Amino acid sequence: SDRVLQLKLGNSAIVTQEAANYCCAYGEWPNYLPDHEAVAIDKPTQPETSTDRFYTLRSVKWESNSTGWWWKLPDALNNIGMFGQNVQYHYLYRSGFLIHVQCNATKFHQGALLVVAIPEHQRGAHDTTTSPGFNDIMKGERGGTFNHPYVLDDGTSIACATIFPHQWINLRTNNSATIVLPWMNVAPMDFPLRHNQWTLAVIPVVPLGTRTMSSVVPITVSIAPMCCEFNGLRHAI
């Protein structure tokens, strides 16, 4: 009942038969920008189904020595489908996100992944006073990897990361995690190419292990923008 779920947006749908309810970040739900909070005065474009749909990124392999993975939003999708086109042709964007992380194995496998959506995850660099560079931050669809997941690569800690919207994928329990993210920013809209509102982090707190037949165990991420709005139309960047 709270273990099965179907998500449908646009021409895309996803089902899971081993869910663990699902998370609504801070108890909120995505919505379009109301007139009393608006700033940009040009009429926005709300493409709906062409952008508010699931985009599945390339999978990653969960290995015995993996440290974890991360994908920044909207960066990870800024070059995918019609969402990517609207982002490139407009100075301003706004949207929520429906995140679905997938990972199945066997009744003989064990492992636990923390799936957390971090707002404003400003990364820190290790053992240097030099700030992270553009290429250390903007990885796009490929996403990045954690150097020191123990401190969330920002000098804090993964132990307290549960203060952020999250779920876990504990192999003996479930095979997917779902998190609904509302627009999260101090401004009603933003320039999509230089600021990432959220960072999706998937970290193996309990390593993958088994004594049965060894198989490649992938982790897949599907993300659907929600209530997309774009302002400041011009040429593509």
Q: Using alpha carbons, select from 6, 104, 88 the residue that is nearest to residue 51.
A: 88
Binding to another protein (CB under 8 A) within 106-135 occurs at: 106-112, 119-134
Interaction residues for another protein, span 149-208 (CB under 8 A): 149-152, 154-174, 177, 179-180, 182, 184-191, 193-197, 199, 205-206
39 binds another protein (CB under 8 A): yes
User: Under the criterion CB under 8 A, does residue 232 sit at the interface with another protein?
Assistant: yes
Least separation in angstroms between residue 142's CB and another protein is 17
By CB under 8 A, is residue 8 in contact with another protein? no
Does the protein bind another protein through residue 21 (CB under 8 A)? Answer: yes
**216 belongs to the binding site for another protein (CB under 8 A):** no
Instruction: Provide the b/e sequence for 166-182 (b: ≥16 CB within 10 Å).
Output: bbbbbbeebbbbbbbbb
Break positions in the chain: residue before each gap, C to N over 2.5 angstroms = none
Q: Closer to another protein at the Cβ: 11 or 130?
A: 130
Integer Cα distance of 88 and 228 in angstroms: 14
CB 11, min distance to another protein, A: 23
Residue 118 in tokens: 């971090």
Residue 32 is encoded by which pair of tokens?
């379009």
